[PDB]
């Protein structure tokens, strides 16, 4: 309940993983 409520208000995680090039290139650079 409480974990799902803040994720449904700001839906940013689903939009950045839709753009697959600009997400795994950002994580691989900071290692």
Curated annotation (Swiss-Prot):
Organism superkingdom: Eukaryota
Disorder this protein is connected to according to its UniProt record: Metaphyseal chondrodysplasia, Jansen type: A rare autosomal dominant disorder characterized by a short-limbed dwarfism associated with hypercalcemia and normal or low serum concentrations of the two parathyroid hormones. Chondrodysplasia Blomstrand type: Severe skeletal dysplasia.
Protein name per UniProt: Parathyroid hormone/parathyroid hormone-related peptide receptor
Record's subcellular location: Cell membrane
Native source organism of the sequence: Homo sapiens (Human)
Glycosylation sites: 9
Subunit relationships: Homodimer in the absence of bound ligand. Peptide hormone binding leads to dissociation of the homodimer.
Family according to the record: Belongs to the G-protein coupled receptor 2 family.
Portion of the parent chain present: 168 to 197 of 593
Effect of residue 28 to F: Decreased potencies of parathyroid hormone (PTH) and parathyroid hormone-related peptide (PTHLH)
Tissue: Expressed in most tissues. Most abundant in kidney, bone and liver.
Function of the molecule: G-protein-coupled receptor for parathyroid hormone (PTH) and for parathyroid hormone-related peptide (PTHLH). Ligand binding causes a conformation change that triggers signaling via guanine nucleotide-binding proteins (G proteins) and modulates the activity of downstream effectors, such as adenylate cyclase (cAMP). PTH1R is coupled to G(s) G alpha proteins and mediates activation of adenylate cyclase activity. PTHLH dissociates from PTH1R more rapidly than PTH; as consequence, the cAMP response induced by PTHLH decays faster than the response induced by PTH.
Processing after translation: N-glycosylated.
């Amino acid at each position: 309940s409480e974990a799902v409520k803040f994720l449904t208000n700001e839906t940013r995680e689903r939009e950045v993983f839709d753009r697959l090039g600009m997400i795994y290139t950002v994580g691989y650079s900071v290692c």
